[PDB]
Design a protein around this nucleic acid. Sequence first.
RNA 1: GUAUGAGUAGCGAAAGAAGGGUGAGAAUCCCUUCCACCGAAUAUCUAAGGUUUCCUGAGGAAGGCUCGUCCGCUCAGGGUUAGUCGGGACCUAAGCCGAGGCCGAUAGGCGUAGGCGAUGGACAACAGGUAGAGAUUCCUGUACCAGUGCUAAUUGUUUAACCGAUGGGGUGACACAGAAGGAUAGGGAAUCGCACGAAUGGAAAUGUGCGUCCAAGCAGUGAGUGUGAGAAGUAGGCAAAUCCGCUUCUUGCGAAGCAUGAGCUGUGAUGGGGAAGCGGAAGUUCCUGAUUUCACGCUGUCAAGAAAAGCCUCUAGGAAGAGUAGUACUGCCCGUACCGCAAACCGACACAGGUAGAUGAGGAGAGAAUCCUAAGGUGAGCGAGAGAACUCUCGUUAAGGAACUCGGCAAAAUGACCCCGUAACUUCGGGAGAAGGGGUGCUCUAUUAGGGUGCAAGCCCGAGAGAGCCGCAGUGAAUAGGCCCAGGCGACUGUUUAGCAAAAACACAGGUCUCUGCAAAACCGUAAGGUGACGUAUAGGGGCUGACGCCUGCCCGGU
RNA 2: UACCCAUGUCCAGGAUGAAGGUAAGGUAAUACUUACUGGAGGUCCGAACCCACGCACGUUGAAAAGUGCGGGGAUGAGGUGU
Lengths: 273, 44, 92
Amino acid sequence: AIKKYKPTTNGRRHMTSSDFAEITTSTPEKSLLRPLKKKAGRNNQGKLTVRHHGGGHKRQYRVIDFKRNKDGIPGRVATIEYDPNRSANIALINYADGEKRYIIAAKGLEVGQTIYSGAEADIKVGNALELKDIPVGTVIHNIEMKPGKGGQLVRSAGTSAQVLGKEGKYVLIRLNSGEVRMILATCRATIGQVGNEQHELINIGKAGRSRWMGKRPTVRGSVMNPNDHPHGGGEGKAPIGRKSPMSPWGKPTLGYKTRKKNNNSDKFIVRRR
Amino acid sequence: MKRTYQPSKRKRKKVHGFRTRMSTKNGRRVLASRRRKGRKVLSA
Amino acid sequence: MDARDIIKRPVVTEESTSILDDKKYTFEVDTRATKTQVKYAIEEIFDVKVAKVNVMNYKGKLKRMGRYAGYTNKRRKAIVTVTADSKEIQFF
RNA sequence: GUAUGAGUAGCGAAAGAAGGGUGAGAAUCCCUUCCACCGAAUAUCUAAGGUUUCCUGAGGAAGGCUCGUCCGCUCAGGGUUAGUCGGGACCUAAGCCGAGGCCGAUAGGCGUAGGCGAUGGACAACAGGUAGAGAUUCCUGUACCAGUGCUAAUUGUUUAACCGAUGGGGUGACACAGAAGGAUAGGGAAUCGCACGAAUGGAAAUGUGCGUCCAAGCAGUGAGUGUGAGAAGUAGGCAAAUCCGCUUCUUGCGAAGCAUGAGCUGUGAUGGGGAAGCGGAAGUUCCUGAUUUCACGCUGUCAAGAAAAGCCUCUAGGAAGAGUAGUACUGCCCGUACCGCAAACCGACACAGGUAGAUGAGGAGAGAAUCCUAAGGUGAGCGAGAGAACUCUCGUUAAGGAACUCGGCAAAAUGACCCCGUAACUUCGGGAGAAGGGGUGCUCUAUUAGGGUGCAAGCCCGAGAGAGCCGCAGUGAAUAGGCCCAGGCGACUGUUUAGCAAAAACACAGGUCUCUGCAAAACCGUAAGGUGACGUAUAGGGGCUGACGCCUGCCCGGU
RNA sequence: UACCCAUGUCCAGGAUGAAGGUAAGGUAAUACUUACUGGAGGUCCGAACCCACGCACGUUGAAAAGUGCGGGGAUGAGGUGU
Ligand SMILES: [Mg+2]
Ligand SMILES: [Mg+2]
Ligand SMILES: [Mg+2]
Ligand SMILES: [Mg+2]
Ligand SMILES: [Mg+2]
Ligand SMILES: [Mg+2]
Ligand SMILES: [Mg+2]
Ligand SMILES: [Mg+2]
Ligand SMILES: [Mg+2]
Ligand SMILES: [Mg+2]
Ligand SMILES: [Mg+2]
Ligand SMILES: [Mg+2]
Ligand SMILES: [Mg+2]
Ligand SMILES: [Mg+2]
Ligand SMILES: [Mg+2]
Ligand SMILES: [Mg+2]
Ligand SMILES: [Mg+2]
Ligand SMILES: [Mg+2]
Ligand SMILES: [Mg+2]
Ligand SMILES: [Mg+2]
Ligand SMILES: [Mg+2]
Ligand SMILES: [Mg+2]
Ligand SMILES: [Mg+2]
Ligand SMILES: [Mg+2]
Ligand SMILES: [Mg+2]
Ligand SMILES: [Mg+2]
Ligand SMILES: [Mg+2]
Ligand SMILES: [Mg+2]
Ligand SMILES: [Mg+2]
Ligand SMILES: [Mg+2]
Ligand SMILES: [Mg+2]
Ligand SMILES: [Mg+2]
Ligand SMILES: [Mg+2]
Ligand SMILES: [Mg+2]
Ligand SMILES: [Mg+2]
Ligand SMILES: [Mg+2]
Ligand SMILES: [Mg+2]
Ligand SMILES: [Mg+2]
Ligand SMILES: [Mg+2]
Ligand SMILES: [Mg+2]
Ligand SMILES: [Mg+2]
Ligand SMILES: [Mg+2]
Ligand SMILES: [Mg+2]
Ligand SMILES: [Mg+2]
Ligand SMILES: [Mg+2]
Ligand SMILES: [Mg+2]
Ligand SMILES: [Mg+2]
Ligand SMILES: [Mg+2]
Ligand SMILES: [Mg+2]
Ligand SMILES: [Mg+2]
Ligand SMILES: [Mg+2]
Ligand SMILES: [Mg+2]
Ligand SMILES: [Mg+2]
Ligand SMILES: [Mg+2]
Ligand SMILES: [Mg+2]
Ligand SMILES: [Mg+2]
Ligand SMILES: [Mg+2]
Ligand SMILES: [Mg+2]
Ligand SMILES: [Mg+2]
Ligand SMILES: [Mg+2]
Ligand SMILES: [Mg+2]
Ligand SMILES: [Mg+2]
Ligand SMILES: [Mg+2]
Ligand SMILES: [Mg+2]
Ligand SMILES: [Mg+2]
């Protein structure tokens, strides 16, 4: 559920957080860990290209299986545990061979279950099949775009898609944003919704809790100088004395569509969001 | 308070040393023009 | 180097001669001679049996002789001690 | 180059006095006694940095804000010793370079294999002595690590002793906070030893002063902390594996066994150190006790906490030599002097500034606060003598008590521990140490009532009450909140103009609008290549508003 | 000096008392009440450390930005070394 804190302190007054009641163990698998170093938004050349990044808790990467190529071998859910690199939780699977791999924990997955993948897999939460043999109307996640690449489209916590129909070589999918899209029928997907759906309701409560996540302060353009931002300057507080609000690099920011107008993938999108 | 120069043996050779000048096209131009004046010491 | 090229000259001072009775001899050796080369150089020249060698490096002192500044030579000093069942070296 | 200001300003935080000595010459150099200052430092080590400033013998031209017989100054000779300490021959992070390679008017940019690169990982020595300068380095004593030869026995020779990866696996390998323990360093009293036993009223002992020990290694032991055992079978671990991982059965448990583990005891010790009068006596018992160690060990939390080498193991492979014991020998390069909260470093200066880390005692005390002291270190590189105005830093003030002033600016006042008591308002947590009050000294009940410690001897901790005693005054010194009522602004903690403005300005958690379907949008770059992101609409970028409570009305003609 | 990256290190003492847990009460069973335990917090007081709000003095300074007496933060959006 969502834990709520008593107003003992002014900085603890509005905080809410998860209780982690679904997390089974607190130690990761040592053989599936890799180091991560903070880039702080710095470029190939050491330049700051993306603002408001850098300076949080240090983390380690968990090698997560998105392809899910291991067909025919049963795998038991061993643990459900915490991943700092993503919003959803992850699950450790002990395959019958004796080898362990990480997957995204779907909603309704608990320890002791058995998970399959391939053509002969049943339509259960946690299994993986190709889109050519998933019945119309089911709710799926971890959709991939190119066969053999690995799961890419629905992956955040609490998100899910839906199968709408089949067009022969392709399959219609309604993505999480409300966009109807044509996906190749040989690509794979996983049944079920991603399971940490309470993630939306967290209240940070503190200025310094955002800094633990690596988020440096953001400054409005209205309190800058004319050589810094198109909104800067003016005696006292000033309104947006321009035709439209503008980004720090020109290029109007309110209502202006930035998708490329001659994009190749425009014929595979049935209807926009 | 504290001043602008804080000495360090390693930091001096890694920025102004001979092997640092020899690694770039414009660093070899500094040595060429210092040899032209006949300066006693080239680089640091 | 040769045996005569590694070893240059003895050191004759108050500290150097106060340890001659202890069977310790102080020499100036080549700047690029290792501790092991000094051991075999001594046995070739004096035919003594060598027990230990200790080496140390000296910088050059900044010296002035009137409007002119320079440095003296840098030295490498070796102290050789010999086994009790061996002959002695006569600095004399 | 030389004048005027002018023998004027200054001579850079601080306590010195006298008696001897040297010398041509002494407030300033040396010695002695007394006095004073620092003492979570102004004490002891050690990194960086500086490069001979270190020691000895001579010197007094210049430097030293005066003097100088002196010196961190001048001259001449000297001084730094490592198989075990720090670094290399071991390992890797950020980062850097980069064969081929991809981009690009030239120049060049990026980047794979590969390699450099500590601020981190691994790794075998301790205790004493050294009268000019070095000490885990030299010397004495006792060790350890790796290797080599030789002597004596053992074993095996291809159904094959033994070795074993540059490969697989395990370990190495890790956050923050909190609490309770074990031990030890340190500290303090008795006992014991040595010396004195006294100047001015008293004391030959319930008198005074000083001291009351010791490694690494080796053998044993050990508070504790982790702690499932065996068997059978293998879609996995680039090939194989008896190793790891996974599955199934027998068997179960604060009971053992395995890993570690601070410390303790014997030896090291026929050795070394030790107050006195060159030799050297004594070294026990008890109390207290860590910020150190067991040890990120245990518990809890969320923000979810390096890599590689090294070590062990498994086969792939190599195999006629191999281990064992005893003895002797071998082990390279760089640094080592000296200063190091400072007169030797960064500030032009022998400059009231700045400079990481380890140790850092006693009384009273919660304390590394505060005052006085211990070990140790200092008396500050111009003086003496008068006690004018004026300036600065301090101490007291009769009566009044903000009348001063732009403004109670500055100063004055409160301040510790224990007990009583405490409002409006409120987001129910607060406000609150609200406000306002009372008690603190010494002696006897009294080696308390009672606790901790120990087998006892004994040793520490010490609240209430009574009786009294003395001062103007009892946290008798230093250190230690002034409080209340009401309004504007900003919810709060935080940040800002190094060197005029600390704020009502910025940020902030929250709200809303808008872009983005992934080779995502956005951004850097000519491009390659990148950040975004090893992310995937509960995610990412941009504009505006700024907790929370109640709300956010009308206009789409113009842009 | 501004921001960032990797790897180390520092913060004497005292106070308050969140979640949770246990026992008694209470119920058809829960709410709930009281005691003990527990040890949270961009919490509180206050040294080292960081900073720079007031005043005074310096102003051919001891100092090209300081000193003296007070002052703010002091477990964190912390200080600091390489
Ligand atoms: Mg942003
Ligand atoms: Mg903002
Ligand atoms: Mg502005
Ligand atoms: Mg403009
Ligand atoms: Mg404007
Ligand atoms: Mg205006
Ligand atoms: Mg823009
Ligand atoms: Mg640099
Ligand atoms: Mg130069
Ligand atoms: Mg050496
Ligand atoms: Mg005058
Ligand atoms: Mg005058
Ligand atoms: Mg002076
Ligand atoms: Mg040095
Ligand atoms: Mg001297
Ligand atoms: Mg003089
Ligand atoms: Mg004379
Ligand atoms: Mg002299
Ligand atoms: Mg000299
Ligand atoms: Mg030795
Ligand atoms: Mg080393
Ligand atoms: Mg090339
Ligand atoms: Mg490159
Ligand atoms: Mg590499
Ligand atoms: Mg290296
Ligand atoms: Mg190092
Ligand atoms: Mg070692
Ligand atoms: Mg010395
Ligand atoms: Mg790890
Ligand atoms: Mg003790
Ligand atoms: Mg196998
Ligand atoms: Mg012992
Ligand atoms: Mg833990
Ligand atoms: Mg030394
Ligand atoms: Mg001086
Ligand atoms: Mg100074
Ligand atoms: Mg300390
Ligand atoms: Mg003290
Ligand atoms: Mg005390
Ligand atoms: Mg203390
Ligand atoms: Mg004193
Ligand atoms: Mg008066
Ligand atoms: Mg009066
Ligand atoms: Mg009044
Ligand atoms: Mg008036
Ligand atoms: Mg008035
Ligand atoms: Mg005032
Ligand atoms: Mg009040
Ligand atoms: Mg009286
Ligand atoms: Mg504010
Ligand atoms: Mg300013
Ligand atoms: Mg100011
Ligand atoms: Mg590109
Ligand atoms: Mg990328
Ligand atoms: Mg605003
Ligand atoms: Mg409106
Ligand atoms: Mg319009
Ligand atoms: Mg219209
Ligand atoms: Mg916190
Ligand atoms: Mg606080
Ligand atoms: Mg400091
Ligand atoms: Mg500042
Ligand atoms: Mg303070
Ligand atoms: Mg101050
Ligand atoms: Mg305060």
